[PDB]
Amino acid sequence: SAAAFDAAEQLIQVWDGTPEALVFEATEDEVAEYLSAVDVAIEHLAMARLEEELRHLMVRHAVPTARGGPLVNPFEDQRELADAYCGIRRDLLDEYLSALGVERLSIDEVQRIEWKHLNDKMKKWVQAVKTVVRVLLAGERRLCDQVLSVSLREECFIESTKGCIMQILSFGDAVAVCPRSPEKLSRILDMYEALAEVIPEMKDLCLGSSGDGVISDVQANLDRLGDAIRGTLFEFGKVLQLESSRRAMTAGEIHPMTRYVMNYLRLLVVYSDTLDALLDMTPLGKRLLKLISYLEANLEEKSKLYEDSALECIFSMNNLLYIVQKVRDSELGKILGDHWVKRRNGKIRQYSKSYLRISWMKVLSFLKDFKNFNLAFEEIYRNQTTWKVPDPQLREELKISISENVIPAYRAFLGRYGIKYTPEDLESQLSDLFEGAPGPAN
Amino acid sequence: SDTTYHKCSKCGYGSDDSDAYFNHKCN
Ligand SMILES: [Zn+2]
Structure with a gap:
């Protein structure tokens, strides 16, 4: 009625x-x-x-x-339903992301920020994007399917999502336009790899072809992070090639560059699949090989910064062994291969033989085919005790090689024609070498 | 006869710290 x-x-x-x-x-x-x-x-x-x-x-x-x-x-x-529903969705999702720790940084704010903070903001963002893909986008599809009884539902999921996408794409752009700094390589890749997921997840949840526009933006954003990764890795290779220091490493110790460069390349290999897709053995293989060549080529010229040819060798040994150890003790060895590693061992083998010849030939001349060889020995011990061979195994074998030549040769020379050092004195003084400190004898 | 373990060919920049060297901008 x-x-x-x-x-x-x-x-x-x-x-x-x-x-x-x-x-x-x-x-x-x-x-x-x-x-x-x-x-x-x-x-x-x-x-x-x-x-x-x-x-x-x-x-x-x-x-x-x-x-x-x-x-x-x-x-x-x-109609008024959609516009309202989508609004509150857009709002609640805005708050989830704020809580997660997603800032909207300007270009000036980005460029002025100190790395230690930018690092933690990127870290937060990757976590946020992982959540958005693996939790939210799925949750927002479940809600629309359950709540709305039209298929409109296609429009609502997308309009509920755009705001959430746009807000992550913002910080994607922030890092995309940031000055190229090797510091950031690993993080940009973390961001790239995280953001890549969105498309699959969005392709699975969007029935229609209106989700193509959002997928287009995400692609363009990915492609720019793709550009940022090629540029960053380029800047690393560029700055490595530019390095030209003529300060000799005291005690012939491992160069800090050797530590940094090899740490860097060891970390790249954790991103082989992405780096192989973006660069154009594997494309990474080719690049890893080039970059290590530059490091060696640089270190070879640093080995010539000595009056003493012996210290040139000790330096080349120590640094070339460290390189090979980091290659063999990681997936690096797998990528650039055995033949590469075998050759470096060859070079290290020859560098040691070069040392033993160069440093111990005049000392084995002071005994013939009055004769004061004490100045020769004292001078070697004087400063070769302050030298460093970091690797215990190599340090042990250099000393055993030295002694086995010099000691029996001195037992004969003295035991026949004889008055300062006994052969035991020399054995003990030989054990003080390469300890990065002046030996107790004098 | 440089006084830092890292030295840029292009700009003057030198440092004994690799991180500081590898993230230096050429001035
Ligand atoms: Zn420079």
Whole structure:
């Protein structure tokens, strides 16, 4: 009847007259306010729209289970639903990401920030993107499918998502336009690899072809991070090639560059699949090989920064062994191969033989095929004790090689024709060598 | 006869720290 509409119209205006109270905190009440909203829709087929109510209750339902939700909309359509729903979604997702630790940095803010902080902001972002892909985008598809009873649902998922995508793409651009700094390589790759996931996840959750526009942006963003990775790695190779220091490493110790460069290349290999896809043995293989060539070529010229040819060798040994150890003790050895490693061992083998000849030939001349060789020996011991051979095994074998030549040769020379050092004195003084400290004897 | 373990060919920049050298901009 028209009286069944009057009663329906009544309680709506009663509820309209108090927007303070929400309809969805009263058991028998919320049951009644639906039946009224149904008769409005029935009558048309006063405005008595009460949508302003249902639109605000839905807002106050999604913000503080999802059963009141999927009933608010069946009565709402029979547009303003979509625009409202999508809004609150866009808002709540904005807050999730803020909590996660997603800033919207400017270009100036990015360029001025100290690496230690930018590092932690990128770290936060990768975590955020992982969450968005593996949790949120799926959750927002589940909600639209359950809540909305139209397929509109395609529009709602995308409009619920765009804001969330755009906000991560912002910081993607921030790092994309940042000055190229080797520091950042590993992080940019973490970001690239994280962001790559979005497309698969979005392709699985989007039925229609409106998800192509968002996928286009994400691609263009990925491709720029793709550019940022090629440029960063280039800057590393560029700065390595430019390095020309003529300060000799004291005690012939391992050069810090050798430590840094090899640490860097060892870390790249953790990103083989990405780096192989972006660069154009593996493309990374070719690059790793080139970069290590530059390091060797640089270190060879640093070995010529000595008056003593012996220290040139000790330096080349120590640094070339460290390189080979880091290659063999990682997936580097696998990539550039055995033949590469065998050759370096060859070079290290020859460098040691070069030392033993160069340093111990005049000392073995002071005994023939009065003769004071004490100055020769004292001078070697004097400063070769302050030298360093870091590797215990190599240090041991150089000493054993030295002694086995010099000691028996001295037992003969003295034992025949004889007056300062006994052969035991020399054995003990030989054991003090390469300890990076002046030996106790004098 | 440089006084730092790292020295740039292009700009003057030198340092005994590799990280500082490898992330230096050529001035
Ligand atoms: Zn420079």
